[PDB]
Design a protein around this ligand. Structure first.
Ligand SMILES: O=c1ccn([C@@H]2O[C@H](COP(=O)(O)OP(=O)(O)O)[C@@H](O)[C@H]2O)c(=O)[nH]1
Length: 474
């Protein structure tokens, strides 16, 4: 009997990517896969890339099905409106997904399809677990960010109990001294501060969507058959050991993409710029500052101007991925100093890039990052030190660990100012600060390679979760 796994990501590229990595692996191991897109995600992909690029090839098509479910969302909802996305999905997708499961069951007799044997839901997509449980189908959840981020979200309830959420004083939401307050009660992260908690706690609304949804997600995941985390156990040991008491068995599989690599579908609305890698070929080893802020976050025009002036004054060539909609508001031209550097060939601004390959390019010496988890996994595998500017969600938690525990990064202030940007980049490129972080980055690169090669800790967890849970139906 062919196992049949249904996978359900949240509609953001950092959630689709790890679940698609897993789906491709399961297909390689002989499973039937059904990959479930929301209509929001699917229609936005089709209008950007066309159906042919988004759907599977005819070679894999027999055992790789794409299905689309209703979500009630306008395609105009932007990726930075996380609460709007989360609220519609949790309210609107359950009954469409229940109907999809029924249809897949009818296809067993109708077309000799394999019965569904497991659902793998993104922790965010709690309806997937609810529907699987109703139907008597095992379900295993996949949290797509860091273990430290999960630990933060797990303690949102305790923030509420201690009166810290919602914020009773709106003036404290951005009070840097208040946000520095230590929270000494988080197991596995004794150095947690209020600002290090994932940022959605910073709300005065007692009915805030993201706090409510996080509580639902934690309760859902606690009831799953198992939990997949795309992280390196060695990197996050203290946090994972603290998480163990609150969840089903945890499998640390990170970096999953590297486990697969050791041993045909476009998931992005953006086109990766092919000129990046050849431009880097023309630059000396370790010389280039690479800047990228992921697929969801936005910044202000003033922040963008200060980053641009900081890059022009930092002393290094740079590759800046400036996503086309990253800046709130009307288009503002880049400063003359940066444009002249681009014209001289010393800098390059592109809309989107092949990120894993860019980070592994010998010319890159530093990653200025928003601290999105997939980006940090890509930097960790590449051995690139990180200068952090966390934006939302668990990016703050990641930044705290980068700085204080993992040791492969340093942080910029939230309020971007060109002079301080240039100075911190310079310290990271030629200073003792950068030497320390780059050396630690090299250690984590070796650790990630050991974990991902055959016999390593992440490799073993991939084999166990795949063979003992995901492919075992039949
Ligand atoms: O120029 C870029 C920047 C990002 N990414 C991909 O977009 C995702 C970003 O996910 P992450 O978790 O880092 O952050 P998020 O986008 O969720 O904030 C990852 O798969 C990256 O490899 C990409 O393909 N090209």
């Amino acid at each position: 009997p062919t196992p049949h796994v249904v996978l359900v990501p949240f509609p953001g590229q950092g959630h689709v990517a790890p679940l698609m990595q897993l789906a491709r692996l399961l297909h390689a191991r002989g499973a039937r896969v059904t990959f479930v897109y929301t209509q929001y995600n699917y229609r936005r992909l089709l209008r950007a890339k066309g159906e042919a690029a988004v759907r599977p090839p005819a070679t894999s098509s027999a055992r790789f099905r794409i299905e689309v479910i209703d979500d009630g969302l306008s395609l105009s909802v932007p990726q930075n409106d996380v609460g709007g996305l989360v609220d519609s999905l949790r309210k609107n997708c359950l009954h469409p997904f229940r109907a999809l499961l029924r249809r897949l069951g009818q296809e067993v007799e109708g077309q000799d399809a394999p019965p569904v044997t497991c659902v793998v839901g993104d922790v965010v997509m709690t309806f997937a677990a609810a529907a699987a449980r109703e139907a008597g189908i095992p379900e295993v959840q996949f949290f797509t960010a860091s273990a430290c981020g999960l630990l933060g979200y797990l303690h949102y309830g305790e923030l509420v109990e201690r009166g810290l959420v919602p914020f009773r004083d709106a003036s404290l939401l951005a009070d840097d001294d208040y946000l520095d307050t230590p929270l000494e009660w988080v197991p596995g992260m004794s150095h947690m501060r209020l600002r290090d908690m994932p940022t959605f706690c910073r709300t005065t609304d007692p009915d805030d969507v993201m706090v409510s949804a996080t509580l639902q997600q934690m309760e859902s995941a606690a009831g799953s058959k198992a939990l997949i985390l795309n992280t390196l156990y060695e990197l996050e040991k203290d946090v994972v050991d603290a998480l163990a008491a609150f969840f089903p068995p945890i499998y640390t599989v990170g970096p999953l993409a590297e486990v697969i690599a050791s041993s045909a579908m476009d998931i992005s609305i953006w086109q990766e710029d092919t000129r990046c890698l050849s431009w880097l070929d023309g630059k000396p080893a370790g010389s280039v500052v690479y800047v990228n802020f992921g697929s969801m976050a936005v910044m202000t025009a003033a922040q963008a101007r200060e980053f641009a002036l900081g890059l022009a004054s930092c002393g290094s060539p740079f590759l800046w991925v400036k996503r086309p909609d990253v800046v709130e508001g009307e288009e503002v031209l880049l400063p003359e100093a940066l444009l002249d550097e681009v014209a001289r060939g010393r800098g390059l601004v592109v809309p989107w890039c092949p990120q894993a390959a860019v980070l592994k390019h010998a010319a890159v010496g530093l990653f200025v990052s928003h601290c999105g988890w997939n980006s940090l996994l890509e930097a960790t595998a590449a051995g690139q030190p990180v200068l952090a500017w966390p934006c939302h969600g668990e990016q703050t938690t990641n930044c705290r660990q980068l700085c204080e525990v993992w040791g492969n990064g340093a942080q910029l202030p939230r309020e971007v100012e060109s002079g301080a940007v240039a100075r911190l980049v310079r310290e990271m490129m030629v200073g003792d600060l950068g030497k320390e972080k780059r050396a630690k980055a090299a250690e984590w690169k070796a650790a990630a390679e050991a974990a991902a090669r055959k016999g390593g800790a992440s490799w073993r967890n991939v084999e166990r979760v795949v063979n003992d849970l995901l492919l075992v139906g039949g």
